[PDB]
């Protein structure tokens, strides 16, 4: 009852700020035009609201500033993965407000009847109706990913008509417009792009495609970083982000596990289900993860489906762990040296809570790989523990965090340092169960 | 004749752009006021010039954007270490222009005689004369580092008076003013600062102080990064940058070799010459240096005095090299393993050209340390070669780059990859002598 409200404590606050700014502008422009009777008042209010929307709807779509903002506490508080579907909501309110604006001014013109404004307004109305119609989900559900882009590129014409349609619109558009164009000028053909080539595409079960793309000769990424994959064979101008699910110590390839959860990522699987093709990835982005390897007995916890970076992190952890098992050639002596300058872990736990393994079968097979690779060493010491709960049937059902944390605190391998990747409700439950045992809780953005 | 002009090909271009913008504004405001006779014309021209200067003189002093700009090709083209002494030049031209402005308007008032403008102008003139007098070099040459800061903080009053003195000045000040205040609001008490404490201060010969400051528990820097040291015992509000001269693999301390080349860095040596005191360093900044360790037979070259980061780079190189000499406990077998995931070098050359070893005696002793540490291994293989030329008397005299590069190309340890740290004249000579041998030349910013 309060956990559901706790997850959306930020989306609700952003929507409340939005509706509050709209009611503020509406009432403000309805007070300053009270003498005009009920038809220019509504129309001028909606005019101010349009001035705001048609201008900031573009500062939402800054996928160059979103990457930098998505690494910080600013991302910890307000959601930035919802920017596409907050932008769609700003588009829907632009359409509704412009409709009531047109209707208000039409009724006003009729009352006055009992060349910039009206003709440029008919032009704006036709353009916004075209963007509305040719920006629905049916345009991209069918394999028309280039009709959407072109017929939705008319926001330039919308802004152009809107400059010499609204007298004071340019003042609004100046800041978000210049920011949008400066970001479009920062990112060009080979700004950060790298024309990589798929070495192979496996089709894992339950509609998830595994892309082994060539690693560009100089590509350095921390474990847990993502990249904006682009495949002109699926969609020419779409750049979708995906977490790299391979440890950086893997020098030959870059893995990407792409789950069929949309209309592009689904088009990928549908096209390869019916390889060396073109791709243009865009850089590694992500939060620094040195807090995990410069730790002791890290307890990684992951809920839901945002645990693709935990695959990369666990693979890197086990790579660095196996990289400190030395064997002498002469006398075959096999010793283990100390924690050395990259990883300081003596133990690692990985607790994965989920509803099921619907799309995460590759994840379970990868964890099985790691557990079996290090399990033949488990007679003297265990380094990676894997708990995988399912909550819908591996120990079925939710954890009992009191018991789990008490067992973690039973054996002492150092200063336990919990890390979390999930919902803020479970984050509250975790910090509550965690401050009792003195574990240094964390929560990663990814 | 053309090398001297080649070094200053960017300072001369910046000064030419500056003088051109001034002559543009002067002539533009002298054309639009041609009817007013010779006294309001000059005064309004100088007014426009002041509007530009008094506004952008502050965008020069953005030591928060300068760190980000100093890592890129944008820093490769235009100089950013001259921002302090370009700012001083903007201050001198502000004073000269305001003097001729005052004189022009005084002669105009006299011609008209044969309450904002004039009184606020007397106030601006007195404030600018105070900043001019109490911002000379004599204020900080004596140990008055706090009189300078306070009596030079009156640029706030100068801007305040200038808003309601010039009608259109606020339009100019809006962008640099908001940028300056946003940068001052980004950096607060503990934004990136770390209240470190000096563990020790050695006084090396020839007026250079070696600060072994405690390494804050979580401080990660690449080899070759700098930090903005601050010592409230020398100067309370001054933040001078210094390159860290210790390899990151040194976990206990952070070294800083501070040469007495000014009035603060000199005050440091003079005060300690006549330890646990307060310091507040500000983060690691610098260009990525992975190109040196992910290389083969890197030929580092350093000219002049900007080779403090080469001390850190060489110490890190030799640390990582000695970190791959394994010895088995049982049979005492001592083997060397392969290039492993951090450093790929099989050889390193370090060619240091300078005029003399005036302040760089610590550097020569450090290179002697490294050469002697690895020289007892030189019977089977040499990893670090050290050439140190002096050009004023170690092989005295300039190198013969044809011979040096031919000797480098004689022995084949991989794909030679020259790196350079020096003047653009020597950079031209190097790229010329380097494209002949197919060495992949580089030039670092630091
Ligand atoms: C850092 C990061 C890493 C991700 N890694 C993966 C991964 O490895 N595998 C995976 O299957 N999914 C991953 N996603 C989520 C998502 O499935 C993909 O990022 C991709 O954007 C989906 O595109 P789509 O066309 O299939 O979605 P659509 O069908 O276009 O839309 C469906 C959903 O995807 C969202 N969406 C649409 N376009 C984008 C976009 N450009 N960026 C982000 N969200 C978008 C919509 O808001 C909606 O919620 C990741 C998301 C982020 C932020
Ligand atoms: C990245 C970097 C690393 C440096 N590392 C070292 C180092 O390890 N040892 C060393 O002796 N010097 C170093 N310097 C140069 C310089 O000596 C110091 O940075 C310091 O700023 C000098 O201050 P000062 O008060 O002695 O100079 P001043 O007496 O105030 O001025 C003399 C000269 O220093 C310049 N200067 C003044 N204040 C600054 C400032 N805040 N930042 C930069 N330049 C300034 C002036 O333009 C002038 O050319 C470095 C410079 C940079 C950019
Ligand atoms: N900034 C934001 O606003 C963010 C929002 N989210 C939220 O993520 C949610 C995703 O849905 P979902 O992933 O189901 O939410 P959860 O993250 O709560 O579900 C994740 C897993 O946690 C399990 N779980 C829930 N409560 C407990 C508990 N008390 N003890 C142990 N395990 C528990 C669930 O099992 P069961 O489902 O069986 O209870 C589920 O398998 C969205 O509602 C979204 O709002 C995600 C990231 C940040
Ligand atoms: N962005 C910019 O504008 C930058 C400017 N600089 C320039 O750095 C200069 C510093 O003075 P300085 O350091 O003396 O200039 P140099 O860097 O040219 O002097 C560095 C060393 O190189 C040696 N040297 C010069 N020419 C040759 C050559 N042809 N072959 C071999 N060795 C050579 C010099 O020896 P000798 O002195 O005995 O000839 C000197 O010891 C300043 O003039 C400044 O303009 C520095 C960085 C960037
Ligand atoms: C984009 C969306 C849109 C649309 C569709 C529209 C449509 C329209 N419209 Fe508009 N508008 C607008 C947006 C718009 N619009 C704006 C923004 C403005 C401004 C406001 C103010 O007031 O400010 C206007 C404004 C306006 C005005 C006022 C004038 C000026 O400029 O000042 C008028 C009259 C109008 C009309 C109109 C009409 C008739 C129409 C239909 C045809 N308009
Ligand atoms: C005028 C204004 C505007 C408007 C109204 C709109 C409206 C809209 N919209 Fe928009 N968009 C925009 C402007 C806009 N828009 C922009 C600017 C962008 C960006 C593009 C790029 O980035 O290039 C977008 C983008 C976008 C996107 C992205 C693409 C991808 O996928 O990646 C999407 C999905 C959208 C949707 C939408 C919708 C649904 C709507 C409703 C109709 N859009
Ligand atoms: C800061 C430096 C400075 C200074 C010192 C000055 C000083 C002066 N001044 Fe000055 N101004 C100025 C800066 C200045 N200034 C400016 C910036 C301006 C504006 C320009 C225009 O025209 O725009 C002026 C402006 C001005 C004017 C015009 C008016 C208006 O506002 O419009 C006048 C009359 C004056 C006067 C004067 C005088 C009498 C003096 C002495 C006492 N002037
Ligand atoms: C009004 C305007 C102005 C003016 C006129 C000036 C003028 C001047 N200036 Fe200044 N500055 C300034 C504004 C200014 N300024 C600023 C804003 C700054 C910054 C500060 C801080 O950062 O805090 C400076 C800063 C500054 C500095 C830095 C400090 C250190 O050391 O670190 C110096 C050195 C200077 C000098 C100068 C001179 C010499 C002059 C001539 C008088 N300058
Ligand atoms: C449908 C709910 C959408 C909620 C959007 C939250 C605010 C996103 C801000 C993104 C800023 C770039
Ligand atoms: C005395 C010569 C000064 C030359 C200044 C060059 C331009 C510096 C630009 C700094 C921009 C932040
Ligand atoms: C300006 C009017 C804003 C209305 C916002 C409504 C949001 C509904 C989210 C479901
Ligand atoms: C606006 C007048 C600018 C004059 C610049 C002079 C620069 C001299 C550098 C030595
Ligand atoms: Zn042995």
mmCIF file of N, CA and C in Angstrom, chain A residues 186 218 220 248-251 290-291 294 323 326-331 333 335 337 340-341 344, chain B residues 68 186 218 220 248-249 251 290-291 294 323 326-331 333 335 337 340-341 344:
data_model
loop_
_atom_site.group_PDB
_atom_site.id
_atom_site.type_symbol
_atom_site.label_atom_id
_atom_site.label_comp_id
_atom_site.label_asym_id
_atom_site.label_seq_id
_atom_site.Cartn_x
_atom_site.Cartn_y
_atom_site.Cartn_z
ATOM 1 N N UNK A 186 27.066 18.374 -31.024
ATOM 2 C CA UNK A 186 28.122 17.652 -30.319
ATOM 3 C C UNK A 186 28.268 16.248 -30.885
ATOM 4 N N UNK A 218 40.428 -0.141 -29.753
ATOM 5 C CA UNK A 218 40.611 0.628 -28.524
ATOM 6 C C UNK A 218 39.228 0.942 -27.966
ATOM 7 N N UNK A 220 37.584 0.703 -24.119
ATOM 8 C CA UNK A 220 37.786 0.430 -22.706
ATOM 9 C C UNK A 220 36.509 0.756 -21.950
ATOM 10 N N UNK A 248 35.150 -6.857 -18.886
ATOM 11 C CA UNK A 248 36.129 -6.117 -19.695
ATOM 12 C C UNK A 248 37.380 -6.913 -20.009
ATOM 13 N N UNK A 249 37.739 -7.878 -19.164
ATOM 14 C CA UNK A 249 38.903 -8.714 -19.421
ATOM 15 C C UNK A 249 38.717 -9.622 -20.625
ATOM 16 N N UNK A 250 37.528 -9.651 -21.214
ATOM 17 C CA UNK A 250 37.288 -10.374 -22.458
ATOM 18 C C UNK A 250 37.684 -9.454 -23.603
ATOM 19 N N UNK A 251 38.785 -9.783 -24.274
ATOM 20 C CA UNK A 251 39.386 -8.879 -25.243
ATOM 21 C C UNK A 251 38.876 -9.081 -26.661
ATOM 22 N N UNK A 290 34.046 0.725 -8.990
ATOM 23 C CA UNK A 290 35.200 0.350 -8.180
ATOM 24 C C UNK A 290 34.825 0.059 -6.735
ATOM 25 N N UNK A 291 33.651 0.504 -6.287
ATOM 26 C CA UNK A 291 33.232 0.237 -4.918
ATOM 27 C C UNK A 291 32.983 -1.243 -4.671
ATOM 28 N N UNK A 294 36.877 -2.883 -4.736
ATOM 29 C CA UNK A 294 37.591 -2.373 -3.569
ATOM 30 C C UNK A 294 36.663 -2.512 -2.367
ATOM 31 N N UNK A 323 42.605 -14.773 -11.935
ATOM 32 C CA UNK A 323 43.874 -14.189 -12.345
ATOM 33 C C UNK A 323 44.867 -14.049 -11.200
ATOM 34 N N UNK A 326 48.265 -18.469 -8.984
ATOM 35 C CA UNK A 326 49.505 -18.708 -9.702
ATOM 36 C C UNK A 326 49.924 -20.166 -9.562
ATOM 37 N N UNK A 327 50.604 -20.662 -10.590
ATOM 38 C CA UNK A 327 51.161 -22.007 -10.578
ATOM 39 C C UNK A 327 52.594 -21.930 -11.085
ATOM 40 N N UNK A 328 53.512 -22.536 -10.347
ATOM 41 C CA UNK A 328 54.905 -22.541 -10.767
ATOM 42 C C UNK A 328 55.130 -23.627 -11.814
ATOM 43 N N UNK A 329 55.859 -23.326 -12.879
ATOM 44 C CA UNK A 329 56.106 -24.343 -13.908
ATOM 45 C C UNK A 329 56.948 -25.506 -13.406
ATOM 46 N N UNK A 330 58.038 -25.201 -12.703
ATOM 47 C CA UNK A 330 59.015 -26.210 -12.314
ATOM 48 C C UNK A 330 58.431 -27.278 -11.396
ATOM 49 N N UNK A 331 58.023 -26.887 -10.191
ATOM 50 C CA UNK A 331 57.571 -27.840 -9.187
ATOM 51 C C UNK A 331 56.057 -27.961 -9.113
ATOM 52 N N UNK A 333 53.876 -26.210 -8.072
ATOM 53 C CA UNK A 333 53.237 -25.639 -6.895
ATOM 54 C C UNK A 333 52.189 -24.618 -7.312
ATOM 55 N N UNK A 335 49.745 -21.816 -5.818
ATOM 56 C CA UNK A 335 49.403 -20.995 -4.673
ATOM 57 C C UNK A 335 48.484 -19.859 -5.096
ATOM 58 N N UNK A 337 47.767 -15.823 -4.316
ATOM 59 C CA UNK A 337 48.398 -14.659 -3.727
ATOM 60 C C UNK A 337 47.332 -13.749 -3.125
ATOM 61 N N UNK A 340 45.320 -7.853 -4.669
ATOM 62 C CA UNK A 340 46.397 -7.087 -5.287
ATOM 63 C C UNK A 340 45.857 -6.003 -6.211
ATOM 64 N N UNK A 341 45.549 -4.843 -5.634
ATOM 65 C CA UNK A 341 45.580 -3.558 -6.328
ATOM 66 C C UNK A 341 44.446 -3.354 -7.329
ATOM 67 N N UNK A 344 39.820 -6.401 -4.044
ATOM 68 C CA UNK A 344 40.141 -6.645 -2.643
ATOM 69 C C UNK A 344 39.145 -7.587 -1.978
ATOM 70 N N UNK B 68 38.082 20.806 -17.732
ATOM 71 C CA UNK B 68 37.485 19.936 -18.738
ATOM 72 C C UNK B 68 37.982 20.284 -20.134
ATOM 73 N N UNK B 186 28.695 25.301 -8.251
ATOM 74 C CA UNK B 186 29.053 23.893 -8.403
ATOM 75 C C UNK B 186 30.120 23.508 -7.390
ATOM 76 N N UNK B 218 39.932 7.121 -0.116
ATOM 77 C CA UNK B 218 39.433 6.780 -1.446
ATOM 78 C C UNK B 218 39.839 7.903 -2.392
ATOM 79 N N UNK B 220 41.534 7.934 -6.224
ATOM 80 C CA UNK B 220 41.992 7.176 -7.377
ATOM 81 C C UNK B 220 42.384 8.141 -8.482
ATOM 82 N N UNK B 248 50.344 5.811 -9.110
ATOM 83 C CA UNK B 248 49.116 5.471 -8.378
ATOM 84 C C UNK B 248 49.245 4.223 -7.529
ATOM 85 N N UNK B 249 50.134 3.301 -7.897
ATOM 86 C CA UNK B 249 50.344 2.096 -7.107
ATOM 87 C C UNK B 249 50.973 2.384 -5.754
ATOM 88 N N UNK B 251 50.318 3.544 -2.352
ATOM 89 C CA UNK B 251 49.065 3.646 -1.619
ATOM 90 C C UNK B 251 49.155 4.522 -0.381
ATOM 91 N N UNK B 290 46.152 5.785 -20.902
ATOM 92 C CA UNK B 290 46.184 4.367 -21.241
ATOM 93 C C UNK B 290 46.900 4.099 -22.556
ATOM 94 N N UNK B 291 47.080 5.120 -23.395
ATOM 95 C CA UNK B 291 47.778 4.925 -24.658
ATOM 96 C C UNK B 291 49.245 4.581 -24.459
ATOM 97 N N UNK B 294 49.094 0.647 -22.922
ATOM 98 C CA UNK B 294 48.595 -0.223 -23.983
ATOM 99 C C UNK B 294 49.351 0.130 -25.259
ATOM 100 N N UNK B 323 55.787 -5.726 -11.064
ATOM 101 C CA UNK B 323 54.662 -6.512 -10.575
ATOM 102 C C UNK B 323 54.373 -7.739 -11.428
ATOM 103 N N UNK B 326 57.374 -12.928 -11.182
ATOM 104 C CA UNK B 326 56.928 -13.847 -10.150
ATOM 105 C C UNK B 326 58.080 -14.735 -9.698
ATOM 106 N N UNK B 327 58.026 -15.136 -8.433
ATOM 107 C CA UNK B 327 58.993 -16.065 -7.868
ATOM 108 C C UNK B 327 58.232 -17.123 -7.084
ATOM 109 N N UNK B 328 58.550 -18.385 -7.339
ATOM 110 C CA UNK B 328 57.896 -19.466 -6.616
ATOM 111 C C UNK B 328 58.547 -19.650 -5.250
ATOM 112 N N UNK B 329 57.757 -19.823 -4.201
ATOM 113 C CA UNK B 329 58.342 -20.010 -2.867
ATOM 114 C C UNK B 329 59.135 -21.302 -2.741
ATOM 115 N N UNK B 330 58.567 -22.407 -3.221
ATOM 116 C CA UNK B 330 59.145 -23.728 -3.009
ATOM 117 C C UNK B 330 60.525 -23.879 -3.638
ATOM 118 N N UNK B 331 60.599 -23.814 -4.965
ATOM 119 C CA UNK B 331 61.842 -24.073 -5.679
ATOM 120 C C UNK B 331 62.584 -22.805 -6.072
ATOM 121 N N UNK B 333 62.142 -20.683 -8.123
ATOM 122 C CA UNK B 333 62.145 -20.346 -9.539
ATOM 123 C C UNK B 333 61.579 -18.949 -9.746
ATOM 124 N N UNK B 335 60.407 -16.415 -12.619
ATOM 125 C CA UNK B 335 60.059 -16.247 -14.017
ATOM 126 C C UNK B 335 59.339 -14.924 -14.225
ATOM 127 N N UNK B 337 56.214 -13.261 -16.434
ATOM 128 C CA UNK B 337 55.046 -13.646 -17.202
ATOM 129 C C UNK B 337 54.801 -12.623 -18.308
ATOM 130 N N UNK B 340 50.065 -8.412 -19.317
ATOM 131 C CA UNK B 340 48.813 -8.896 -18.744
ATOM 132 C C UNK B 340 47.877 -7.750 -18.386
ATOM 133 N N UNK B 341 47.096 -7.304 -19.368
ATOM 134 C CA UNK B 341 45.796 -6.675 -19.148
ATOM 135 C C UNK B 341 45.868 -5.263 -18.574
ATOM 136 N N UNK B 344 51.159 -3.320 -21.690
ATOM 137 C CA UNK B 344 51.539 -4.169 -22.813
ATOM 138 C C UNK B 344 52.922 -3.829 -23.350
#
